[PDB]
């Protein structure tokens, strides 16, 4: 009964955001709560933020 | 009553790395100004970034071009890292034409009088076929902050690039003892800045100070 | 009757079908968003049964495949 089929492939880039799940290899899992601005992050004596 | 700091030295360590010395500073003002200027420099400095790319024969970034080493998406990522300073206008269109085998770098971009390429060796892609040729139109816009393409509101083939307009990469500041003619309780603030080479360190410092002063105008006359 | 895939869809503006070709199929590389029509289809009730982008699935069209049975005249995009 099928006359024809059109398959459309959509590519979407998912950027990281709060609510996404991150984890290490050690079982340390968590959910992102906030996207902190670069100037708000803790930084070292050389000014490099984490 | 307070001694006003002055810009006394600018040590251009490299093209993208500089140190600016403010002197003299009273107690506490060194760290106050250091943190305020660090935050403003990291958040609010204006710069030119690639926002749109049009590669001939390319419909979208999730595709390949014959004779090109990199994927179109990887080419867009490389163009995102292109550092350009534009003079006298907030938007420019650069033309890149290259043929033959070899790395296609920022030096191959067509020369524009109002456009300066701070890092001509920035690799854009690689052509691996002698008959292969790449031609693209790159849109460079002036802005500030981070502006993702998805939050930005076009013929097919015009690929949007996330715009990281901020020329400032890293800011550190150190407050140390200053040698005054007669005072000993004065400090000097050394601001170490690493940029993409598209902003003058003195221009950045004056820009941040102007932003801070205009933001302080509201508090200066509270009502 | 037989369902038809075409660019002639009722009760939809021309601007909403600028991403479709003459065959009613979205172009390669089109930046689609939730609600955009990908393949225009009509059922002879003609009802609007076109394949639309699912809500909040704004993405880019990278590939289109067409499969037609024997005896069916494949369209221009096909």
Resolution (A): 2.1
Q: Range of B142's domain?
A: 46-164
The stretches of A1-50 forming alpha helices (DSSP H) are none
Q: Is the dihedral of CA B7, B13, B15, B17 positive or negative?
A: negative
Q: Is B216 helix (H, G, I), strand (E, B) or coil?
A: helix
**Helix or strand (DSSP H, E) at A30:** strand A29-31
| Structure tokens belonging to residue B192 | 């170490």
Chain C residues close to B154, C-beta within 8 Å:
31
Name which of A15, A49, A35, A34 is nearest B42 in CA terms: A49
What single-letter DSSP state applies at residue A38? G
> Residue B192 and residue A47: Cβ atoms within 8 Å?
yes
Q: How far is A19 from chain B (nearest CA, A)?
A: 18
Before B24, cis peptide (omega within 30)?
A: yes
CA distances (Å), origin B184, targets B22, B32, B44, B97, B181: 16, 19, 34, 61, 9
**What's the CATH code of the domain at B55?**
2.170.120.12
> Residue C62 and residue B60: Cβ atoms within 8 Å?
yes
Q: Is B156 helix (H, G, I), strand (E, B) or coil?
A: coil
Distance CA C26, CA C37 (A): 8
Are the C-beta atoms of residues C65 and C25 closer than 8 Å to each other? no
Are the C-beta atoms of residues B156 and B56 closer than 8 Å to each other? no
Distance CA B199, CA A34 (A): 30
What method did the depositors use to determine the structure?
Answer: cryo-EM
Question: Per DSSP, which regions of B14-101 are E strands?
Answer: 17-25, 46-55, 84-86, 91-99
Long-range Cβ pairs for the range B31-34 (8 Å, 24+): B31/B175, B33/B5, B33/B189, B34/B173, B34/B174, B34/B175, B34/B189, B34/B191
Distance CA C53, CA C36 (A): 5
> Residue A38 and residue B43: Cβ atoms within 8 Å?
yes
Q: What does DSSP say about strands B123-127 and B102-105: parallel, antiparallel, or unpaired?
A: antiparallel
- Which chains have 3 or more CB–CB distances shorter than 8 Å to chain B? A, C
**Helix or strand (DSSP H, E) at C5:** strand C4-5
């Amino acid at each position: 009964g099928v006359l024809k089929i059109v398959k459309v492939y959509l590519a979407v880039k998912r950027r990281i955001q709060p609510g996404d799940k991150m984890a290490g290899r050690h079982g340390n899992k968590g959910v992102i709560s906030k996207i902190n601005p670069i100037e708000d992050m803790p930084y070292d004596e050389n000014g490099t933020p984490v | 009553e307070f001694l006003k700091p002055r810009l006394v030295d600018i040590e251009q360590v490299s093209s993208t790395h500089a140190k600016v010395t403010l002197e003299p500073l009273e107690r506490g003002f060194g760290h106050t100004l250091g943190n305020a200027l660090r935050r403003i420099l990291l958040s609010s400095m204006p710069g030119c970034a690639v926002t749109e790319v049009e590669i001939d024969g390319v419909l979208h970034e999730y595709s390949t071009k014959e004779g090109v080493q990199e994927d179109i998406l990887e080419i867009l990522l490389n163009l995102k890292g292109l550092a350009v300073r534009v003079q006298g206008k907030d938007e420019v269109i650069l033309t890149l034409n290259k043929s033959g085998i070899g790395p296609v770098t920022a030096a191959d971009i067509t020369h524009d009088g109002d456009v300066e390429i701070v890092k001509p060796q920035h690799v854009i892609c690689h052509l691996t076929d002698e008959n292969a040729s790449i031609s693209m139109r790159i849109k460079v816009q002036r802005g500030r902050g981070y502006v993702p393409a998805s939050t930005r509101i076009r013929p097919i083939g015009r690929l949007l690039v996330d715009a990281c307009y901020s020329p400032v990469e890293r800011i550190a500041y150190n407050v140390e003892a200053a040698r005054v003619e007669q005072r000993t309780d004065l400090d000097k603030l050394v601001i170490e800045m690493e940029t993409n080479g598209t902003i003058d360190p003195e221009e950045a410092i004056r820009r941040a100070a102007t932003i801070l002063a205009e933001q302080l105008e509201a508090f200066v006359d509270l009502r | 009757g037989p369902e038809e895939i075409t660019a002639d869809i009722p009760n939809v503006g021309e601007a909403a079908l600028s991403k479709l070709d003459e065959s009613g199929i979205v172009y390669i590389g089109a930046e689609v968003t939730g609600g955009d029509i990908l393949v225009g289809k009509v059922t002879p009730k003609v009802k609007d049964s076109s394949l639309r982008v699912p809500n909040g699935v704004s993405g880019t069209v990278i590939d289109v495949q067409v499969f037609t049975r024997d005896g069916v005249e494949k369209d221009k995009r096909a």
